[PDB]
Amino acid sequence: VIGTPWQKLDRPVSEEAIEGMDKYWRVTNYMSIGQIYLRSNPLMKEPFTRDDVKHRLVGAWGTTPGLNFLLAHINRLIADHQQNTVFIMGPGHGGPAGTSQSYVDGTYTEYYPNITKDEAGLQKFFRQFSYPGGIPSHFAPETPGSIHEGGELGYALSHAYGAVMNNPSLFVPCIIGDGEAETGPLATGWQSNKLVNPRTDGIVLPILHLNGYKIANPTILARISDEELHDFFRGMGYHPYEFVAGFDNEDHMSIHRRFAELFETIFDEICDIKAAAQTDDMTRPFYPMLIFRTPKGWTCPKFIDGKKTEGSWRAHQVPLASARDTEEHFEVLKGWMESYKPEELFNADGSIKDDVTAFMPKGELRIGANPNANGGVIREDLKLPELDQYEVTGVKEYGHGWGQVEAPRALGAYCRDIIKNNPDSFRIFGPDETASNRLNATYEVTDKQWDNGYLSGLVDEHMAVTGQVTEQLSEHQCEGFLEAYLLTGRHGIWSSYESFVHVIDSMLNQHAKWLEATVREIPWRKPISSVNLLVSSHVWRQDHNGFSHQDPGVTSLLINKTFNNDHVTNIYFATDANMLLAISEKCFKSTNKINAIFAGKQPAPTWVTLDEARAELEAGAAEWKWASNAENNDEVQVVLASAGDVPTQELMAASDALNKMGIKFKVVNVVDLLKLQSRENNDEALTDEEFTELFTADKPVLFAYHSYAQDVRGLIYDRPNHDNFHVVGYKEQGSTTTPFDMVRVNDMDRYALQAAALKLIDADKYADKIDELNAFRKKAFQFAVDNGYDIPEFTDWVYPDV
Amino acid sequence: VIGTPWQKLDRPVSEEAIEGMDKYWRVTNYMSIGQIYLRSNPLMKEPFTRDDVKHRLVGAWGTTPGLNFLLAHINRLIADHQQNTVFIMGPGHGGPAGTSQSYVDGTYTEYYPNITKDEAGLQKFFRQFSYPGGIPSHFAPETPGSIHEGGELGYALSHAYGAVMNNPSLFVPCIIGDGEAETGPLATGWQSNKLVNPRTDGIVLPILHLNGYKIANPTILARISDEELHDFFRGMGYHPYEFVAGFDNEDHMSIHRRFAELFETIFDEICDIKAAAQTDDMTRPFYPMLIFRTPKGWTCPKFIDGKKTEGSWRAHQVPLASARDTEEHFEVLKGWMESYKPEELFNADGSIKDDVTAFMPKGELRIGANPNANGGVIREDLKLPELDQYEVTGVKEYGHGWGQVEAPRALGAYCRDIIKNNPDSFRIFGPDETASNRLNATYEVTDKQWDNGYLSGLVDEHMAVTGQVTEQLSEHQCEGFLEAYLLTGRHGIWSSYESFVHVIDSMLNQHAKWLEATVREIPWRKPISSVNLLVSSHVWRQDHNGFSHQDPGVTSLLINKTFNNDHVTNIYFATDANMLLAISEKCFKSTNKINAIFAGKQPAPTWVTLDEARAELEAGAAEWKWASNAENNDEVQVVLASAGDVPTQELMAASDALNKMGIKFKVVNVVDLLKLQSRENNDEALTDEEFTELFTADKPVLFAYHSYAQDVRGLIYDRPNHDNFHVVGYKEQGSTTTPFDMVRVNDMDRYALQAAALKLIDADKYADKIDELNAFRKKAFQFAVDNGYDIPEFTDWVYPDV
Numbered sequence A, B: 001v002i003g004t005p006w007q008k009l010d011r012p013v014s015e016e017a018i019e020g021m022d023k024y025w026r027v028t029n030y031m032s033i034g035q036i037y038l039r040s041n042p043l044m045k046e047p048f049t050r051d052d053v054k055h056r057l058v059g060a061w062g063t064t065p066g067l068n069f070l071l072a073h074i075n076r077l078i079a080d081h082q083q084n085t086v087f088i089m090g091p092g093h094g095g096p097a098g099t100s101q102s103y104v105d106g107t108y109t110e111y112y113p114n115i116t117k118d119e120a121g122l123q124k125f126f127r128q129f130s131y132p133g134g135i136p137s138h139f140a141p142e143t144p145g146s147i148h149e150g151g152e153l154g155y156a157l158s159h160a161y162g163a164v165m166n167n168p169s170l171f172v173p174c175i176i177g178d179g180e181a182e183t184g185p186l187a188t189g190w191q192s193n194k195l196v197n198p199r200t201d202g203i204v205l206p207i208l209h210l211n212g213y214k215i216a217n218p219t220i221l222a223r224i225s226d227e228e229l230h231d232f233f234r235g236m237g238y239h240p241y242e243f244v245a246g247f248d249n250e251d252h253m254s255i256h257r258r259f260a261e262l263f264e265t266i267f268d269e270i271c272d273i274k275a276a277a278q279t280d281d282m283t284r285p286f287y288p289m290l291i292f293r294t295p296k297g298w299t300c301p302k303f304i305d306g307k308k309t310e311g312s313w314r315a316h317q318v319p320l321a322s323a324r325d326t327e328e329h330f331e332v333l334k335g336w337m338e339s340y341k342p343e344e345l346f347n348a349d350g351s352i353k354d355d356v357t358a359f360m361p362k363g364e365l366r367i368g369a370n371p372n373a374n375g376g377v378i379r380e381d382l383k384l385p386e387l388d389q390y391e392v393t394g395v396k397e398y399g400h401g402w403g404q405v406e407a408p409r410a411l412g413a414y415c416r417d418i419i420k421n422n423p424d425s426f427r428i429f430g431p432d433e434t435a436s437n438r439l440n441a442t443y444e445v446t447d448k449q450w451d452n453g454y455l456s457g458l459v460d461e462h463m464a465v466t467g468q469v470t471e472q473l474s475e476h477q478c479e480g481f482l483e484a485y486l487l488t489g490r491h492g493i494w495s496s497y498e499s500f501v502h503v504i505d506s507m508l509n510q511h512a513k514w515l516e517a518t519v520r521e522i523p524w525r526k527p528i529s530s531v532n533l534l535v536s537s538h539v540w541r542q543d544h545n546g547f548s549h550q551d552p553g554v555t556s557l558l559i560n561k562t563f564n565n566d567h568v569t570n571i572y573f574a575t576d577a578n579m580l581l582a583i584s585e586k587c588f589k590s591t592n593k594i595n596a597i598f599a600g601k602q603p604a605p606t607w608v609t610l611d612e613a614r615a616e617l618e619a620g621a622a623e624w625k626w627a628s629n630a631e632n633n634d635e636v637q638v639v640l641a642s643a644g645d646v647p648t649q650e651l652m653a654a655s656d657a658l659n660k661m662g663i664k665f666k667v668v669n670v671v672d673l674l675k676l677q678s679r680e681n682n683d684e685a686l687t688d689e690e691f692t693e694l695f696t697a698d699k700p701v702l703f704a705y706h707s708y709a710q711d712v713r714g715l716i717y718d719r720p721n722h723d724n725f726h727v728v729g730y731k732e733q734g735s736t737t738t739p740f741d742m743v744r745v746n747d748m749d750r751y752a753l754q755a756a757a758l759k760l761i762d763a764d765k766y767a768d769k770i771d772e773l774n775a776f777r778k779k780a781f782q783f784a785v786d787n788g789y790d791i792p793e794f795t796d797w798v799y800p801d802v
């Protein structure tokens, strides 16, 4: 247990805590300005001149003094209440507030020994911010205390609420920009309070940083009436509190006392809610939220060159753009830095004075030190059930190609038992698709958690105020809740219809960026569990839907995060349920990855046994010798290769026909896509020798790919024999139609694959056969048109091994 | 002018209109069930049996009777008030309500002559829905009345509000699913009422289709208290009205009278607001919105197999999944279809009776016929200013490589004058980035439109309650408002920082899908203006930002919509401002496209004159002969090729050095990326002959690409000499750093490009030179580290022609 969770003080905040908060605010404003502006002379020692100012002034001031003020108060709260706390910096361009917080709390020097608590360390700290060879401008993963960089705005609330799930002792004050709140993902994130339980989860306090402006405009929420703003937050299930300061001549000490009193009222309300939830965990409370209204750039010069800067969008980026080049800007910068009276805040040796930090929390309660902000320190391996009990044994009993299994059902049973063995640290998220994607065996041991109204057992089923599945119709929610659940040390999986994965392409990009930086150069940030995403209801089988819903292209996006041997991104094609089991076990063991797991949920053949799946997954791509009819690679006339359940089924059927014609070939299945890249691009890929062994040195390769052919063409560009691959993929063709028609119109159907193999082998010799196969495709299409279902010869085919 | 906009009735709805609405509701419910279930015998003529039921039951019933009810009432309103109206079907899986609406209003038979108003046309209409060779399951672009297919939920409100901008006579009732409202994009779409003006724009009525459920769960908004739900809509600037029906034994005629009375109250309020706005167009009104609470699947069987179906998520998809296979399901289907009493709704010849449609609107007021729902019928070409006045003449006066122009400033001046010439039909959207991306010359002739609070001219600048620029910090808003502005026949452009384009990858995918279907097989849906997106503040120059903000990967996504010679997607690299002018003119003339226009906003050289830019754009890729030093392709030792402003600058500098060494080369710039694809993949690309002429038959090609090398490798896979291309692109390397460092770490800097050229030519001979160039790169990096700015020899280089 960290600290003493949810304790009230029952005494006023001390005057000494008020004095310390004002010193914190002054010193963190001072050092945030130092980071932006100063390449040397951090204490302004004689002579202090333009030569001390950076040549490239970069970073963001406007949000920063508001964050510094909130961080003083959150620090005071954590210390007084001993409260286990992670904050979220929504406006992550306020990085200098977050580096300052860590430098003050002592974690910065602990993690970065060269940046010492003295004049020399302070000079280094100022120069390195947003500087070549230095540190980022945003609240990046290399900053102690961050689980959210906040460069791409919108995810602050989903990360806050995912952090508190199954984390009943954790408090997350979530600082949200008022520009940020105009984003879609932020706007829906407020609604998460219907999906958490006040007894079994922790508590988020949203704090709207209502500073009136974004970069070049006021914000929507800052200019609507007070009555609408309060109605809005009350309508989303919060009790809104509002603080206003900095717009008149109120002295700063008065402001601190008034805020501390308010923040104690609010925290008391949170403690009452946590106490009450021990007895009534079914009534959803109105959680407090805070409207924090202060002038953007607070405490900077009110006017610069005749233009209003404090209290304006003009304070957003870097005021005094001429601070190095003109004596006029320089003198303004000088008076601004001096207004914080740094001579009272630092000792002559440049260390921050003891009376600046005596109010601060200590040890693992520090923001920079709490292990929830470095969740791989808390993470334990899952207790995984044995895989063999889930195996589809039909392949071993009856033959390759057996049965009509819906592949994700096996992963559902596996997930069910993972939750049973790990009952508060593995969650399933889904955008109203968990049952649709066949993972609902999990409901045998837990419920979908819903903390909103119930009506009747005639409609409410597998649903309770606490449980380990969470659904909301928002991919942004599911992805953000999961990412934070992982970043604070837990585990899970979510599922999505494949084309809708693209709604969160940019969140996958941010998490891939977080992982890249981390595996490269942040070794104190320990490994977290992987994002595991079941990508199902795919392009080939969108029975109730249609053309608009056919887009397997997240493959292509994930290919753009496969560099530098980071190994943070995997693309897997689950050929069948036994392969899906073997991929899932590997994903659930893995850390510091995004794993995209492609699987079909439609009834489909099972091709491999579980032992075969384990070996083939490790290699990445495998010959299926039992399906090849060639003696060796020299006797091969064509390599039949596929990735994805549906291209594999069609390729297999083509192989059966090609065999019956006397054509010699081998069959190769590809599961771990990026293992096709060359070793130069991927030091864990197939060597050239292993790749030639599979694909031959010089025979044609027909490659039936689940997604856009582009992906495979680009990946194998420097591979031996790549000129001989003919890659058939989805090509933006389809409608709402039968299964045969969907493959037919992308030349993916067995008949067209058989034809393409023949064309690659001898187009002249097989001209007539190719015509007949293309006419069979029309006849099968006409059959579907006339009769309402596909031709039996197509649907009823079973591989001859069965 | 269409109809008589914003007129009140001042009399009760007639009883005859009530009778007609109930008949409409009954006949559209009946035909929606016919579309889902019946392959023949649409009037249930003796014998009606299981053999008439479809073999594959696909589609969505739950939303549909609620849409059918609203469409009866919206139709009655349009007819009585003569009101110019487009609706949005948020729950676009309710396609059968939308096809039914068009069949009833007569547009369906007008657009599709084979689907006649009689028993034979009705049989065809039922069979074709979601059927091979037939029509989509959703409200697709092939349905008269659709501007929004609603398969990927979330964009209903942004499309509604973009439809009404500059459209003061248009009314848009926007039907929003209650599941849909849990999405991010929908949640922020409510806030659009702060960005429209009640005098110069039209009016959206949001109607929340609060049917209590999504696919397998209740919805958040349906289970919160009434008091929170109303506070929520009042807090977002609406006057909420609520209707509840279908949960008790109230007779349907009573329900229609009560709704018609309510909808007249609401429309009266909208007319009052429109009248008042003629005098006070500065006060933002509280626009009505409607909470419509009715049982999901309303009028279907209450229980099926002992399970509650009406009023449940169980009604979402297809009830009676056994209707063809069991007599038990069949008898339930039969009694359900009969409950609507089709014998009163159709004549013996199968035509819909006259008394079913006498209340309906006629002519261009019909939902299916209104030209706002087929905006290419209304669209006129822009009155474009002459391009030559914007030209950067420095190239002609002083030489190739001249000056320090910020390229988008020229497009800003061009846009300024387009707005001047087209003052109510060309809009600019931006996510708080219009000024940042340098398009703010537009503010010389218009303002950012903001219909929310003002404070002071010290902060409010270039901002008014009416204007042709709209900004909100949401890419989903900017993209959705623009798409609808185009779909209703107007024009525009938006700009985004490049990495944030990925927030709306999936909206680009939906609009590309809409365009693909349309150019292929919907010739009555006339061409609309293109989506034009200025992609700027790119990967190479993110001065205040950092690693997290470096992702030019929308290229790769757009490559997945380049099929079938649809020609709906363009990727352009603006080499400089004159090229940006020539690309922009082409984009602003073009129709039925998405145009991604890549340009740097940092000060940069200008390479080509405007005449050169016009020719080179047309070809797609061009030798720059004035920069090549080789006599002919046989004397070329390496082809220096680039796409993007920054790779071009670095390649050019490399060319200067290579020339000074005595190396023979040619320079080729690539603007229209997809013109690199082969003719087999793109019938408008360079022929093989033109491609070899540029890139040689067999010399090495060093290709410096703005984005991920993967894209170019895949595109040129079947091109002559492709094995000799070495593509250098962004490779996930960077930090917050100087301009030289960002190119350096992706091997994109001039020194590394010069080295790579030497390596391709003779790695042994040039081993030492390559070492020296790689050491210069370290020295330049160390200089940046020590000094705070890049080495003068890097920054001060100008191409020798200047």
Ligand SMILES: CC1=C(CCOP(=O)(O)OP(=O)(O)O)S[C@@H]2Nc3nc(C)ncc3CN12
Residues within 6 Å of the ligand: A062, A063, A091, A093, A151, A152, A153, A154, A176, A177, A178, A179, A180, A181, A183, A209, A211, A213, A214, A215, A219, A296, A316, B431, B432, B433, B473, B475, B497, B500, B503
């Ligand atoms: C407009 C924009 C920003 C303004 C945010 O203003 P605010 O939130 O009120 O913060 P503050 O405390 O400074 O006043 S930072 C941002 N990061 C972004 N993210 C996305 C998703 N799209 C665009 C940008 C561009 N950038």
Ligand SMILES: CC1=C(CCOP(=O)(O)OP(=O)(O)O)S[C@@H]2Nc3nc(C)ncc3CN12
Residues within 6 Å of the ligand: A431, A432, A433, A473, A475, A497, A500, A503, B062, B063, B091, B093, B151, B152, B153, B154, B176, B177, B178, B179, B180, B181, B183, B209, B211, B213, B214, B215, B219, B296, B316
């Ligand atoms: C859950 C989901 C749907 C339920 C929508 O329920 P509702 O809106 O209450 O409609 P109704 O009137 O039927 O009750 S349709 C949908 N389309 C989707 N779009 C996206 C962005 N992600 C997932 C899906 C999956 N699909």
Ligand SMILES: [Mg+2]
Residues within 6 Å of the ligand: A177, A178, A179, A209, A210, A211, A212, A213, A214, A219, A296
């Ligand atoms: Mg702000």
Ligand SMILES: [Mg+2]
Residues within 6 Å of the ligand: B177, B178, B179, B209, B210, B211, B212, B213, B214, B219, B296
């Ligand atoms: Mg619903």
Ligand code: NA
Residues within 6 Å of the ligand: A717, A722, A723, B717, B722, B723
């Ligand atoms: Na090749």
